[PDB]
Amino acid sequence: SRKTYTLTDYLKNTYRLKLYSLRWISDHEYLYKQENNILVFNAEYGNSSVFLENSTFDEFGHSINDYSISPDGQFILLEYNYVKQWRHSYTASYDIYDLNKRQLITEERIPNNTQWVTWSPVGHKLAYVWNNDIYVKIEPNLPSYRITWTGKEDIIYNGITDWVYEEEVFSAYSALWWSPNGTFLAYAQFNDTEVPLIEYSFYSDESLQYPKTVRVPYPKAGAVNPTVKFFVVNTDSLSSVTNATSIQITAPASMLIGDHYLCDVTWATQERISLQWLRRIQNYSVMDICDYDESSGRWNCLVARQHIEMSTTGWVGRFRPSEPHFTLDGNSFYKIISNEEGYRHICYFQIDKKDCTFITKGTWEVIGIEALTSDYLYYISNEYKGMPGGRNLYKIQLSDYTKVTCLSCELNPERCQYYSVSFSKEAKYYQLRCSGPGLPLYTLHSSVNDKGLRVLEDNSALDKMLQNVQMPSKKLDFIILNETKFWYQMILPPHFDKSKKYPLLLDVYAGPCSQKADTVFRLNWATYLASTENIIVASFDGRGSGYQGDKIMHAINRRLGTFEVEDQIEAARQFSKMGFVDNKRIAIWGWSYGGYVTSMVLGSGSGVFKCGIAVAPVSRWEYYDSVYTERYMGLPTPEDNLDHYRNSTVMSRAENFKQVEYLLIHGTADDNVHFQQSAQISKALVDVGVDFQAMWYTDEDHGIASSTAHQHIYTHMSHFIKQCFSLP
Amino acid sequence: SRKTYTLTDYLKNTYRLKLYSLRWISDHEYLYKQENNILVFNAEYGNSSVFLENSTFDEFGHSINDYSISPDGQFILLEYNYVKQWRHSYTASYDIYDLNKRQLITEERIPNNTQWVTWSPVGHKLAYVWNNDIYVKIEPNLPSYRITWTGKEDIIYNGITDWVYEEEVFSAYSALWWSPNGTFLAYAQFNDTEVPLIEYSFYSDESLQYPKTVRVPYPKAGAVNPTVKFFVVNTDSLSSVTNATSIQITAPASMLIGDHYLCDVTWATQERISLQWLRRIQNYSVMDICDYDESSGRWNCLVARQHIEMSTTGWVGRFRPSEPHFTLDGNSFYKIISNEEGYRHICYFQIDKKDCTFITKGTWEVIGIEALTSDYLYYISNEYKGMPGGRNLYKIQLSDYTKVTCLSCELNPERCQYYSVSFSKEAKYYQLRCSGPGLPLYTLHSSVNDKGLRVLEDNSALDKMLQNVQMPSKKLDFIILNETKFWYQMILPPHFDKSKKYPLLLDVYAGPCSQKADTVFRLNWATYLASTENIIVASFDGRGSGYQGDKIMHAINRRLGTFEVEDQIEAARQFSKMGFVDNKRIAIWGWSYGGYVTSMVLGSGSGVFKCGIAVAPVSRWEYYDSVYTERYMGLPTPEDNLDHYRNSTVMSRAENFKQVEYLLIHGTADDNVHFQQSAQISKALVDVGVDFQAMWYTDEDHGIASSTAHQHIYTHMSHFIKQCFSLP
Ligand SMILES: Cc1nc2c(c(-c3ccc(Cl)cc3Cl)c1CN)C(=O)N(CC(=O)N(C)C)C2
Ligand SMILES: Cc1nc2c(c(-c3ccc(Cl)cc3Cl)c1CN)C(=O)N(CC(=O)N(C)C)C2
């Protein structure tokens, strides 16, 4: 083939994967944009028609960033002037556009600088957030109603998350939840008043004479947390003369006695809300079931029917308490629980009764509950073949739990072993999405007979190109250690000779519930390293990794920077055993948590590694945020777990670094893992007399993802790996 | 065999230059600290007596940072708890010890956290500064009088300088001048009210969870400067029950029409102060003569006695208008001035007369006036043998100016060509200190017939130790560009062989009025590079360099980053035509201004340099401070010099760096050249895909001089230079 997958190919996207992103607009149609025209498709028969023509906005004036369409298709939301803040948050300008007419709404427009916007679940109501305040417009051309007046920048958040919550709790900027009706609007309020600030320089354009200091409320492990309230407003009864009345649903009392989080919000029915709360020590959580009393207007949450969750071995849930999927009638739900043997399975709860019933079981885990109908529940799991890094779609029959059919396993077993799914409203149809090991494959299906209806995107175009190129293969297998199977992967150079010896790169994340050994097809830096530079690129899922049961996942509880670290080192040793690695040229690298584990590995004097790269690492767990850190570490107090906070820093290993080449890299505007963390790493290395290489990226945040920086760091890191391995 | 001068010998200071540091107490005695015993020496005959036993204060229980014995030595100040701020400023605790007894004073102590203290010129009054307010103690055990009440952290400075005055103007934290009596306290007051603050993180020990943000009033080029007022208080008439009355001296109308600085304060007599001011456009300075009115109680300056300095070619003075040296009666004074030929010489002014009269002339320069009697004026200049890089002490008979005789020229013409001096009161004796080209040599002399009295320090210890090492040698010499001489120096490896080609490191500074080609003996990094690594380290004084007259110094006027940059390049080209340099291995590097030039050079595309190092560079002149920048560049406005402010940035030249290996280094706590300057360079290089190398130093400032940082940067730069030269 002559040609390899080059650094420039990765950097420049020479070889692109086609996807198939559709948005279901009912039980049987969906939107999909062809070129830049928006099509609507009939699912059963496959015929499509143009829904919105690209030309419709050539005269709009602004470049449009995204669009959202109302449940009843009368209107369409156009998002422009998009300015990204954190990992999910951003502000933007908005226009709505009437579709029955071909006219753009000019009266009572949504404000510039809006922080969040969302239609009601049905109809064409709008709720948005602006200046930390919540507004509702019944009609798109009608004046809005102000629902809160408390909003204050960096202090009072109504209907949106502060930093920790967006990042660690809801994975979203949003904190609004319409009732299925579109009648109630629930929302959360966060109070950050006494939360300390992280302050760093942002240097901006050369033209800026003095650097700006950014100040964000950010609780580090042990520090004062934001506080939260929850409210529900009756949308229907919005007066033009009266301020609007928000009803408060206070947390359980088992929560109110100390710090706690609102971690899940789920409308069960028109008049039933489920709220899940989490104590600040995250081994204990409470689910409340709240019903609207039409007479009193209140929302009552009978103590009797709270559902309680505890862990003896760790925290609750994989990253947080699992979500409840309610049956249509609202009198019961399913939800992923860790069972008697510490494997996560689907439990079935009935609203006013004790315990729950496990409908699945086995030495493997359900990954997520995906859909629910009267006959069937649909979930993704890693049952098939006992590969914890595989995913398939299953359904179990509700009237007889022993009838579990697999919907995706045998579809095309050499190519697809990792699916996700998207169900149309009411689950009449699903799109399967296979991610590997072969090229991505998007197909439709109908629920009745689970017939495959058609192929949506088979990525044929990509395939014909890579036939020309010299691509690495991927080995998924496992080693045994004490008596546990531990899964790894190698990305192997083209024309692999196990009689030859290759430099190896241990690519680590290895953070809690991580999994770096899977069946996913990727085109990335590693592909480059293997194809062009003939470097093997390994990942190993050691203790602390996920999707294999609490025994392994919890092995690291309160004890970060130990077994997950030890195990990476041990894997490198197994990898040397296998006689196709150059035991002399082993390297290691990670981003984020991977940077922390990498640094610790390099500071353990193991002797196994020659050099490694750490990007935006944690260095000391008191520096990272409360919600994430305390989950595994508890509090940094003498009475809790300060001893291991102090004892699990990178800085304290600095002396050992003189036995390796180390490259340390961090963005200065990193709002997540603060430049501070590496600012301390280098000082400790300096103070002890160890030479090391370094690179800062000015104004880049945690993702060091701007196009120029992203090309620059992988170019810089590629040089560092080449030199280490003596590669031409 | 012999051994070599290693990286470690430098870092660990294996070979030490001894000094003889004394301070003159009278016309005939001096104080000298020896083995922590404080001794009094009689100059004439050499006999000494122990003034204070090194054993005293073994009972103190603090480390004692420094001492200060009152003029009339009844008391001694003990400085402890010293904590450094900027280059001069700091805070400390004090105690007074009564020598005329045996006890420390217990009551009315000087406060902790005091910012400045000083005795009066005679006796033992005390002036000090605490929380930005001035206090005076007539007697050490008595309570202080409060002089000002306006002091406010970061905003009003009474009796002390802000950041720019400390750094760029007075080269001192002090803004107190006692009159000769001890009768008057004169002081300045500064107002940084509207001055902008540079902000940066300080990370501190590992134990600090949240990084600190430091904030310094600091005017960048073009921005709002502090304003200043000057006051004189009478120490004698301090009423214990009435707020002391301060007399303000106003700046001349020709300064009050705009932004100006107070740039020099000198007491002429008991009743006459000289004040020099300088317009913010440093073209124009005015010396005011102020007499104390005995009846008015006030101070008057007759516009008639004003003396005005204008430079049309550049700025006034080498860095500022020169210091006036008054005759005993205060009716006349002497001053260094650039003459018509642009060379700096001694001028003679009489108070109530218009111009002045030059005491010296010729194509060399006077560096400084050192002592004045009725018979002679003593000065250092670089006349001898016409070497600008040399320094010698001269005395000029004041009754006949043709009668200039040189005092240190022929003492040891081989060993000593660079002298500095220190006279006793009334100049009966003087200590000479030569610093090169041989080991430093400290000598004492009587002035009646310029007889040498004795050797104080000959550095025989160092001499003995160096016999065992292959020291490099130092060529000093000049080349001709466009029909003018320009000097350079070359540190040459031991056993230099003009037949071989050596790699060449160019060591640069090149700031206005700088000088890197001189006759002084240094033990530093270059010395290591030449002795062990056999590298030539050369330095060159091109245009803009000082001590050679205004044609050369002022060439750079308003065009920083041009002629001094072209010229460092042309010198390197000339250095290849010398047949002992490898023109395939030529490096360049510099700190501070040296960093800016090294960067401008590596970015010029000359192709002359293989690689360079820049340490704490300026990148854009709008980033540096007003007083220094606008001195050479004017204001950054479209009416003045905006265009060349922007034509002179490093960032503009980013592209050309792909042709070179570039290492960029900077401390994150640089209060002086802010880390911003370097963060903008790296962002420039990143936006255009130039790979390069970086290193920041956590919490280090412009000096990067903490012991561990110091060692790490030079170890790091040494690797870079070595690998770049492919040295074994
Ligand atoms: C919401 C979240 N998402 C991600 C990470 C982390 C995270 C975990 C630990 C640390 Cl120390 C820092 C972060 Cl940002 C967090 C939670 N804060 C992370 O690292 N990512 C990369 C990843 O998960 N990959 C590359 C597999 C994505
Ligand atoms: C008061 C002062 N003292 C020094 C320097 C500068 C200076 C000049 C230009 C720039 Cl951009 C920055 C500084 Cl800090 C200044 C005035 N700011 C400097 O650099 N030094 C090095 C030196 O004496 N050498 C290397 C010979 C010592």
Short mmCIF file of C-alpha atoms and ligand atoms in Angstrom, two decimals, chain A residues 87-88 163-164 166-169 171 218 319-320 507-516 522 560 591-596 616-619 621 624-625 627-629 631-632 670 672-673 677 702, ligand 1:
data_model
loop_
_atom_site.label_atom_id
_atom_site.label_comp_id
_atom_site.label_asym_id
_atom_site.label_seq_id
_atom_site.Cartn_x
_atom_site.Cartn_y
_atom_site.Cartn_z
CA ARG A 87 -17.80 21.81 28.96
CA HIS A 88 -21.56 22.26 28.39
CA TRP A 163 -19.55 24.89 37.71
CA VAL A 164 -19.43 21.75 39.86
CA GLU A 166 -22.63 21.25 35.26
CA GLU A 167 -19.40 19.24 35.30
CA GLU A 168 -19.94 16.58 37.91
CA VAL A 169 -23.67 16.15 38.59
CA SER A 171 -23.47 16.97 32.79
CA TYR A 218 -15.19 26.28 42.39
CA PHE A 319 -20.65 7.91 38.88
CA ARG A 320 -23.92 8.75 40.60
CA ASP A 507 -1.78 4.88 27.02
CA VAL A 508 -3.50 5.33 30.37
CA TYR A 509 -6.66 6.79 31.76
CA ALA A 510 -7.39 4.26 34.47
CA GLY A 511 -9.57 6.59 36.50
CA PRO A 512 -12.56 5.14 38.44
CA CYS A 513 -15.06 3.25 36.25
CA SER A 514 -12.84 3.92 33.26
CA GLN A 515 -12.45 1.39 30.48
CA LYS A 516 -9.65 1.68 27.98
CA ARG A 522 -10.87 4.72 16.45
CA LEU A 560 -6.65 6.80 44.71
CA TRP A 591 -4.40 13.21 29.74
CA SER A 592 -6.17 14.39 32.89
CA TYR A 593 -6.55 11.46 35.28
CA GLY A 594 -4.28 9.60 32.87
CA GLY A 595 -1.74 12.33 33.48
CA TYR A 596 -1.99 11.81 37.20
CA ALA A 616 -3.13 18.53 32.52
CA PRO A 617 -2.60 16.03 35.37
CA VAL A 618 -4.00 16.06 38.83
CA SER A 619 -1.00 16.26 41.18
CA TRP A 621 -6.36 15.70 45.19
CA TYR A 624 -9.51 19.04 42.23
CA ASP A 625 -13.24 19.57 42.77
CA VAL A 627 -18.00 16.27 43.98
CA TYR A 628 -15.62 14.12 41.95
CA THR A 629 -12.83 13.81 44.49
CA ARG A 631 -16.81 10.53 45.85
CA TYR A 632 -13.67 8.39 46.05
CA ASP A 670 -7.63 25.32 32.41
CA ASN A 672 -11.04 22.13 35.33
CA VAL A 673 -7.67 20.76 36.40
CA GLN A 677 -1.58 21.26 39.67
CA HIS A 702 -8.54 21.48 29.80
C1 LIG C 1 -17.30 14.91 33.27
C2 LIG C 1 -15.93 14.37 33.06
N1 LIG C 1 -15.72 13.97 31.79
C3 LIG C 1 -14.44 13.62 31.47
C4 LIG C 1 -13.38 13.55 32.37
C5 LIG C 1 -13.58 13.87 33.71
C6 LIG C 1 -12.42 13.91 34.64
C7 LIG C 1 -12.14 12.81 35.52
C8 LIG C 1 -11.00 12.93 36.40
C9 LIG C 1 -10.18 14.10 36.40
CL1 LIG C 1 -8.81 14.17 37.41
C10 LIG C 1 -10.45 15.25 35.55
C11 LIG C 1 -11.58 15.08 34.71
CL2 LIG C 1 -11.91 16.41 33.71
C12 LIG C 1 -14.91 14.30 34.07
C13 LIG C 1 -15.30 14.56 35.51
N2 LIG C 1 -14.71 15.78 36.05
C14 LIG C 1 -12.19 13.14 31.63
O1 LIG C 1 -11.02 12.96 32.00
N3 LIG C 1 -12.57 12.98 30.35
C15 LIG C 1 -11.69 12.20 29.48
C16 LIG C 1 -12.09 10.72 29.59
O2 LIG C 1 -12.96 10.35 30.42
N4 LIG C 1 -11.41 9.91 28.70
C17 LIG C 1 -10.34 10.58 27.92
C18 LIG C 1 -11.61 8.42 28.63
C19 LIG C 1 -13.97 13.29 30.10
#
